[PDB]
Enzyme design. Sequence first.
Site, PDB file in Angstrom:
ATOM      1  N   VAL A  94       7.784   7.612   1.080  1.00  0.00           N
ATOM      2  CA  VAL A  94       6.349   7.689   1.342  1.00  0.00           C
ATOM      3  C   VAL A  94       5.740   6.307   1.492  1.00  0.00           C
ATOM      4  O   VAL A  94       4.741   6.125   2.196  1.00  0.00           O
ATOM      5  CB  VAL A  94       5.662   8.486   0.226  1.00  0.00           C
ATOM      6  N   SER A 132       0.858  -1.172   0.000  1.00  0.00           N
ATOM      7  CA  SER A 132       0.000   0.000   0.000  1.00  0.00           C
ATOM      8  C   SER A 132       0.895   1.222   0.000  1.00  0.00           C
ATOM      9  O   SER A 132       1.855   1.283   0.769  1.00  0.00           O
ATOM     10  CB  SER A 132      -0.924   0.020   1.211  1.00  0.00           C
ATOM     11  N   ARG A 133       0.582   2.179  -0.870  1.00  0.00           N
ATOM     12  CA  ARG A 133       1.424   3.353  -1.042  1.00  0.00           C
ATOM     13  C   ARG A 133       1.423   4.225   0.198  1.00  0.00           C
ATOM     14  O   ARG A 133       2.487   4.599   0.697  1.00  0.00           O
ATOM     15  CB  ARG A 133       0.950   4.163  -2.245  1.00  0.00           C
ATOM     16  N   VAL A 134       0.242   4.542   0.712  1.00  0.00           N
ATOM     17  CA  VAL A 134       0.120   5.374   1.901  1.00  0.00           C
ATOM     18  C   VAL A 134       0.103   4.500   3.148  1.00  0.00           C
ATOM     19  O   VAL A 134      -0.964   4.213   3.700  1.00  0.00           O
ATOM     20  CB  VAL A 134      -1.146   6.242   1.829  1.00  0.00           C
TER      21      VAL A 134
END
Lengths: 59, 177, 290, 501, 478, 53
Positions: free
Chosen positions: E424, D363-365
Amino acid sequence: YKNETIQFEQQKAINQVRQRVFQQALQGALGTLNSCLNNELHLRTINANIGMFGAMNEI
Amino acid sequence: STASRYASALADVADVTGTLEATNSDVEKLIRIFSEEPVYYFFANPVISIDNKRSVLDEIITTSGLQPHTANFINILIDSERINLVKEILNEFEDVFNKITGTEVAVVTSVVKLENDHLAQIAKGVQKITGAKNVRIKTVIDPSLVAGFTIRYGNEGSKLVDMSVKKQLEEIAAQLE
Amino acid sequence: MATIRADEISKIIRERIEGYNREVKVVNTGTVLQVGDGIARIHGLDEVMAGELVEFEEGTIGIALNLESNNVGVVLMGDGLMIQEGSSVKATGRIAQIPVSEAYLGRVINALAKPIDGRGEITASESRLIESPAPGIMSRRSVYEPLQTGLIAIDAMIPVGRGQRELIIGDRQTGKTAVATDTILNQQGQNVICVYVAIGQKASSVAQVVTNFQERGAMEYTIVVAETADSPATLQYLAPYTGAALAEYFMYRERHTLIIYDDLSKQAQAYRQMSLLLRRPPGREAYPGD
Amino acid sequence: TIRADEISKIIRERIEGYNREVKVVNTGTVLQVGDGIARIHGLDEVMAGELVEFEEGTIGIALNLESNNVGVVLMGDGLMIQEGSSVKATGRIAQIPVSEAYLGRVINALAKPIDGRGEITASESRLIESPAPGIMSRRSVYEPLQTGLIAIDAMIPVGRGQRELIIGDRQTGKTAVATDTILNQQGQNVICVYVAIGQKASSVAQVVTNFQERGAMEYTIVVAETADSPATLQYLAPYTGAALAEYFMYRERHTLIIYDDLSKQAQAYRQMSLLLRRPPGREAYPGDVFYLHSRLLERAAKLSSLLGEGSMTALPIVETQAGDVSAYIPTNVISITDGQIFLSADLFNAGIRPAINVGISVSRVGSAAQIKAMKKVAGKLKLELAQFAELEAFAQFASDLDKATQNQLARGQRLRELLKQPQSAPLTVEEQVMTIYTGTNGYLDSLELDQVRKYLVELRTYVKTNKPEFQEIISSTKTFTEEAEALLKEAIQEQMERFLL
Amino acid sequence: KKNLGRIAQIIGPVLDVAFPPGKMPNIYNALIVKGRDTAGQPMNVTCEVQQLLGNNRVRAVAMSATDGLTRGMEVIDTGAPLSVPVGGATLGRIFNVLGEPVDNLGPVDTRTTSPIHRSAPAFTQLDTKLSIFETGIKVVDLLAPYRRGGKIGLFGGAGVGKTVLIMELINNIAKAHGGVSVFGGVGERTREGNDLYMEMKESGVINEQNIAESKVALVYGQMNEPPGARMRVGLTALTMAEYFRDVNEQDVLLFIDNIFRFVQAGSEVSALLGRMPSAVGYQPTLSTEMGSLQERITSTKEGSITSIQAVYVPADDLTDPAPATTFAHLDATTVLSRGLAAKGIYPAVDPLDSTSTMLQPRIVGEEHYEIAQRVKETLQRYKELQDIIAILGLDELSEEDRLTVARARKIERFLSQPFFVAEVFTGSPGKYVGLAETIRGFQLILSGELDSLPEQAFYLVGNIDEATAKAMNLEMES
Amino acid sequence: LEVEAKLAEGRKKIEVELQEALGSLEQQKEDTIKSLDSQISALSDDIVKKVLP
């Protein structure tokens, strides 16, 4: 939830009997329009929907 | 369609000719001619000698007396074996005629065989509503038309406009609504 | 004739009504009845012999693909956004000619037998047929000669043959053309006319090896045949025949001569696109059989 | 229940205002019907993508305004529909009615009631394919959508507005993975879209039973397509859920969608264009399915604050056909999804539902919406899981595992015990970060790890009773304060004695 | 009096339109429906006139969505290829594929609009220098030296973070290249597009103040784009890039993704078009289309076109004819593994699988290509060693075999280094790893100087000094 | 054990009482379906009369 279900049954019968008497009223109207003085009421309504056709036409 | 293209070319031939009416008459006559399923099969069987079919074709071109542009149209057509694909292009010629014309055939459908005056009012109103050059009225005294009528108009009979039991459908809808 | 009879309606079926009990010949001009994306179905030009060029009315050389009955499918050599519907492609008649001499040697020729290099038009007065016939077995001698690969493992393993027909299977950046380039450097002393055919390579890399060949001076011995990928698959698929014509000019000029065809697998997909561009029945990875 | 009384009022009251209004009704003779596809001779007024209706009431969207007929995707089946019946060109283009009013109710895919509670009005009529969340029209997914799946919502943070695949094998309670996410969706002001696309209607009924006994169906909307649907109904109910999502979404709320599953929908669109004989592509999908998925998946966003910061937290189930990551369905499915959540079918075979193969998941975030509570509670857990995989990579060699090897190995084996939950148990974000600091404390190493089952639960219970103010610290302040960590450690040693008791 | 043909037939974004029988528009002529929504007259159907079908009708690629499109609606054809707001007007403007502002900035100055169906740069006209381009990333510096002025691509499977490595590439090269930057989000998950817009703002590559002086332009066609919309979005991006490379004659930093998605769009578009899909799903048109794509992407002499592109290398099939067809036309394809991210390497390039035109001793320096071939064959031997390593394990292997195995294992681990913006997901602030510090690290690793440093210590360790400090941390950790 | 005993007993008793409620509303609405055929005939006149515009 059972009370909500009971009111759902209530609404179900509400629409059910509404549709039932709707069908009954429709049958009465059907026999009536069959019984209509054909050319007379059809000519009233025919010039009427002719004017309504022209009404949609100007639109 | 390419059948519609054949019809459009026949109409174009009759139109630059001016024989849109004349080859339209030829179209109706030849339609009733090719309406004969034996004649349609005999002209349309692959077993047909197209020599003998061309013989019988000029024979039939006499036997109804066809106009020359539509005659050569039929000659190219049966020559190009779309005689097998014949009849509906013939039918499409009708619409091509209306495509030539703008005389829009619209089918009314009423409880009675309605008034020709009421027919005139509706055809005039559809000549405005359609915006039409003319209107071939196509009447119908429909049985399930309870009292009112039903004019299928438009390119097809697409543009239905009906008040016979249609309002009863609307009333049953608003009941169901 | 589901395709033709649709657009025949405006003219050609109006012509068919016009000429029904009549047997005619529009047999030179294919008015470009249907046309899509380099592929045309031009009505007419029936007396166009098979393989002819077709002088498109806008100016384009339609390559003769398939004579259907009413129209014919033709392969546009060029960018046929110019041509309008029903454009009377004259049949340009010259069936796969090839301006052929030694004139293109020392020049990066484009696929049109024009110079891609900008070294001007190679004054190549002969016309070798681009679709050339082939060398018969009676027309063959055995390749008695050894050819100089310079790749000592190659000439150790597989003897490079003057006249011979080897193919290099490879890999995505084998850089296999560089092996060909040093072969051309080996050919730069070998008294062999040299061809550097280039189908759909990076025209950047084509210029890189072109500079390397010019600097090598194998580009003296070489012409460079070039059709990068954005050009017509007419040109891309066909251009091997053009190199063969130049080669046969040098080879009916009896020379030791050697050609380097940069991937025809590119040309394979090009003719695959030609086959589906014909909307024909294609097969294994959309290749035709042929 | 006496509807007999005002029926004369209401029936005539609907006949009151029976306008029966008159416009030019365009129509088509359905020339050649077959396989949900129409040659409609006529309907020359082919406004493309308008819904039209056969004389049997069979809805249909335009698939081909053809030059001869009109080719129409007959939505549903026209099994009673003969050729040449009139389809009124009804003009309204894909505009299924959306409001909040359909909530708590199972919708049949044509916006009919699969509830059986009856009909419900809806004011909006969203066209089922409209534009998706624009570039300016999105904002950051700053807010969370705390998933309630333990090291998912710690590690792979489900965000408000976000997008993440949930790849996984045969219905494994993969259904229940989504359902346990939905139990958390009670607590938010988030609209939950229980898109059971084409699922087992038996198990879907089980899902609804669990949802409604769970009651978060108040906070949800059950999108119900039976497995035996029209393949178009399967092939379009995604768009229906998209519209119903857009309602609460352009009502600026947090919202959340759960598609289960696009794979059956991929089979459907394969079957649909296949029935069209449109030549399909790699692995017999037609190509635009991904585009259909892009029709589907590109809606979800924590939208702009200019748009109103409405979150649409879509996350679909993604069927693992044999674990083949290069299924063209999965191959596309990753390519859209900003997160990819691959499940643990071996741990499903270990029964260890909630079973997530966390390495292959992504998952990116990961922490932009995981709280300072959650991030400062579980970054150690993230690396603890990673090093648990590391000292779990090839621990079959050394033959006396040192307290470095074995204590990290049993700490991470304890972590393997620790993420495990009984299904449908959405634990608190409090309890989430609580067990996070617990494993970070490492104190449950001396649990013979099944001891941690009662131990962590009763520890949450004793902080529930005793220091619920620390839950207020961990949630209100939502930063891993050493006051909250202090009370957690106090209750941790306290329950450590009490579970030693 | 441009021909307002009727909307003849509509299925998909290929609409048929009956033009005038005299006046049919050109191939690739733009067009526009008179057009509607329910809300008024959305005239938005600009269209790419694909094929002159005939009978005055022609099939065309409408550049928008097709709802409500009445069969017979009058499309006035532009009769010409579509022109886009090219040039520095786009610099700052997130341009739509339509040339409109996808930024919802002001409508850009229409002085520089351009026909994106355009010619390619000639072999005479192309620049020809084999200059490399600096990276800051480990194998990106080392193995495939990215060439200055070229279409360096990255073929990768989905979920690679082709997004991620492309964005870290954007982060480094953007600040690095003073050339004009043009990014094409093409079928992109426009969540990440919004991330990219936020990032350009955050970098000043959208200098929001002095939006003209953003000096990096966005062209986005999101995932939700239709395929004919997704068809020539790259063509418009290339057209504005060509304004940069010819009109501005600037150095064209030019990133774009996804070209495989562009191929998929053209595939389904030709599926709409009525043409036989040649490959597994691909159109026959795919070949010369992608060639025309790469052909505008020629590094011109006026502006060389450092065109970083990406292939969504589907299904991990290199022999998918998309990636196969791409593998020719790219100049330097970074082949990104899925597997090294199962090993955890971010970036996960199989540097074994990637290849540089720039890879030469004469090009890279003989020291560079020498140590590079050393590390490359170390990898190759490691991969060969993996076969016997798999079942049997290394106890049957030799000690030189174990020497090479741990050596190339160290090479692979030191090839892992963090990326700059990559935090991120993960959290690491990347090192812009220069080529020579990388060269010294390769020297230590293959030379076995680092063979006392730990493999796990070299993992995501930027410099060999940084590896030495990380190993000092590990050797401190006891 | 005993709390869950009386609680599941409460589930069963509320179930029985709600079952009585549902059957009673069933008889009520069934009687209402039987009730006011007079209002149904008022509607029979009404939609016929309002039917003919």
